[PDB]
Amino acid sequence: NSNICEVCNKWGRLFCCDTCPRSFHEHCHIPSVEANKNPWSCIFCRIKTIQERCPESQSGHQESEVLMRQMLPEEQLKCEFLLLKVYCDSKSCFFASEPYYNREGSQGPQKPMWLNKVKTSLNEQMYTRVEGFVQDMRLIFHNHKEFYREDKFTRLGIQVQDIFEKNFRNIFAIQETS
Ligand SMILES: [Zn+2]
Ligand SMILES: [Zn+2]
Ligand SMILES: [Zn+2]
Incomplete structure (x- = not known):
């Protein structure tokens, strides 16, 4: 995973995506990074899953x-x-x-x-x-x-x-x- 926050480009207390190499500060990610959940998928991943589940959505x-x-x-x-x-x-x-x-x-x-x-x-x-x-x-x-x-x-x-x-x-x- 990345060693800087994807949003603000700073190191610090980072949470790592399990399905891509991005990382986030807790309140940089939107929504704020979820308490538990292992694996965890960041919002970039979740959006890509939506497109993949419904390819026509990109028309x-x-x-x-x-x-x-x-x-x-x-x-x-x-x-x-x-x-x-x-x-x-x-x-x-x-x-x-x-x-x-x-x-x-x-x-x-x-x-x-x-x-x-x-x-x-x-x-x-x-x-x-x-x-x-x-x-x-x-x-x-x-x-x-x-x-x-x-x-x-x-x-x-x-x-x-x-x-x-x-x-x-x-x-x-x-x-x-x-
Ligand atoms: Zn950040
Ligand atoms: Zn991700
Ligand atoms: Zn479909």
């Missing part, structure tokens, strides 16, 4: 259809992995914890949002459809763009949203287009 889908799906176990898992893929980028540090807003010439967002809040929401099964999760994720970046205006720091929002959006397309197998 193209319409985003509109994906968003209206109910958060049954498989959609729940897919959202958890998508969240994890965002945390895998070091720039996610900017969007992880609860922000605050005091900048000359700007007003804070009406509805603040941050990755840890989303993480808690998923963990507490607060989303009934994929839409709920996707809206909150896109809100993080939209709020950031709006607040930082013409400061070049707006680019961080664009960059992390691109990571989100590419992984969303890949995980939910959105139909490729030009």
Whole structure:
């Protein structure tokens, strides 16, 4: 197995996947690494099993259809992995914890949002459809763009949203287009 956490790229107290060589800190993995369970399969493995059990699941889908799906176990898992893929980028540090807003010439967002809040929401099964999760994720970046205006720091929002959006397309197998 790897000797660094797959998500944050740090050594420390790592839990090892039994079916691939990745490793995780406890709370880096999403969901948090399970108490017992030997063997244990990480979320990368579980997602691959879903694709393998239903190859047709990788055929193209319409985003509109994906968003209206109910958060049954498989959609729940897919959202958890998508969240994890965002945390895998070091720039996610900017969007992880609860922000605050005091900048000359700007007003804070009406509805603040941050990755840890989303993480808690998923963990507490607060989303009934994929839409709920996707809206909150896109809100993080939209709020950031709006607040930082013409400061070049707006680019961080664009960059992390691109990571989100590419992984969303890949995980939910959105139909490729030009
Ligand atoms: Zn980690
Ligand atoms: Zn694995
Ligand atoms: Zn099948």
